[PDB]
């Protein structure tokens, strides 16, 4: 599937988890739309923090 | 054929219906969680 | 007793160890009202003797 999620409102923490557990064992491609992030490019050295 | 045990007017000693268990305890009860709607002001009332 | 999948590849040729297999034929199922589960048990070894 290509399950797309518009809003995480009534996400029962049990079934809110079960989707992620299905991504790793069924190649499920999921989506979120209400998330904001300011990620930035990092050099080869100094890895991840 | 066979008149009911009532309306016949004599005392008697007959059978019943039973079960085995404590019946009321299973070690549990309905266990539900409730996720709150996020914040106020954005809740929809208008469904008529 | 539980063994590992790395030791099953390095065990000496003529050294026989014992690895127990779970029966579990008679086991009472859970009640109607209880918490659910999320993507559980994976089993890794199987006898083929039998």
Rounded to whole angstroms, the Cα distance separating C46 from C28 reads 25
The closest of C24, C27, C20, C22 to C1, measured between CA atoms, is C20
Give me the phi and psi of A31, to 5 degrees please: -135, 150
**Residue with structure tokens 């070690």?**
B27
CB contacts of C38 in chain A (<8 Å) are: 14, 17-18, 21
Residue from C36, C37, C38, C42 to probe the interface with A (highest A Cβ count within 10 Å): C38
Q: Would you mind telling me the total number of residues written for chain B in this entry?
A: 48
CB contacts of A14 in chain C (<8 Å) are: 35-36, 38
Give me the phi and psi of A4, to 5 degrees please: -110, 135
Burial pattern A3-42, b for ≥16 Cβ within 10 A else e, equals: eeeeeeeeeeeeeeeeeeebeeeeeeeeeeeeeeeeeeee
Resolution to one decimal, Å: 4.1
Rounded to whole angstroms, the Cα distance separating A46 from B11 reads 96
Rounded to whole angstroms, the Cα distance separating C5 from C44 reads 8
Q: Is B21 exposed, middle or buried (0-12, 13-18, 19+ CB in 10 A)?
A: exposed
Residue from A9, A14, A15 to probe the interface with B (highest B Cβ count within 10 Å): A9
Q: Is C17 exposed, middle or buried (0-12, 13-18, 19+ CB in 10 A)?
A: exposed
What was the structure determination method? cryo-EM
Rounded to whole angstroms, the Cα distance separating C15 from B31 reads 51
**Residue with structure tokens 């266990």?**
B31
> What is the nearest CA distance from B30 to chain A, expressed in angstroms?
17
Say if the Cβ atoms of A9 and B37 lie within 8 Å.
yes
Structure tokens at A21: 């557990």
CB contacts of A28 in chain C (<8 Å) are: none
The closest of A6, A9, A30, A7 to A18, measured between CA atoms, is A30
Rounded to whole angstroms, the Cα distance separating A18 from B30 reads 22
C7 secondary structure, DSSP code: G
């Amino acid at each position: 599937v290509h399950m797309t999620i518009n809003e995480r409102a009534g996400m029962s923490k049990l079934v809110a988890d079960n989707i992620i557990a299905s991504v790793i064992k069924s190649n499920w491609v999921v989506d979120i739309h209400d998330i904001e992030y300011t990620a930035e490019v990092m050099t080869p050295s100094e890895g991840y923090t | 054929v066979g008149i009911p045990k009532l309306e016949v007017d004599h005392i008697s000693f007959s059978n019943v219906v039973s079960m085995m268990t404590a019946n009321i305890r299973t070690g549990d009860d309905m266990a539900v969680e409730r996720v709150n709607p996020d914040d106020v002001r954005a809740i929809n009332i208008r469904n008529a | 007793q539980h063994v590992d999948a790395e030791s099953i590849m390095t065990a000496p040729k003529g050294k026989l160890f014992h690895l127990q297999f779970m029966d579990g034929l008679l086991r009472p199922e859970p009640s109607a009202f209880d918490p659910p589960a999320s993507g559980e048990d994976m089993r890794l070894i199987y006898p083929l003797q039998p």
